[PDB]
Amino acid sequence: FLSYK
Amino acid sequence: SLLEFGKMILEETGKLAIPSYSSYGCYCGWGGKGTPKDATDRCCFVHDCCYGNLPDCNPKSDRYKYKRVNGAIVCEKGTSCENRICECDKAAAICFRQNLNTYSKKYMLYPDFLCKGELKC
Secondary structure: OOOOO | OHHHHHHHHHHHHOOOHHHHOOOEOOOEOOOOOOOOOOHHHHHHHHHHHHHOOOOOOOOOOOOOOOEEEOOEEEOOOOOHHHHHHHHHHHHHHHHHHHOHHHOOHHHOOOOHHHOOOOOOO
């Protein structure tokens, strides 16, 4: 509950 | 979405995707130009290409479910999009893990202005 891209 | 992808990254790398991978190199973030800085950055480049091949979907927003069987990530059947998005994320999370030995702190908080020139997928 925590990746971008 | 970033929720599912972030979860995989933590499970596979032991690091919180944000802020660990959200500002890394030229491709781990929102940017998308220049030559990837290293292996980890190439993982993000590839992830972008994977997402770029899901025109009929909403990679960043669409929510999907996944499980872990025998210690490995398993994308179960949902919508075609949910399955494909899951696979793109799975491949990248594992890529990050496989390349942790070359993850370099110097590439964190990397300014996009240092990244220019479109690179073909």
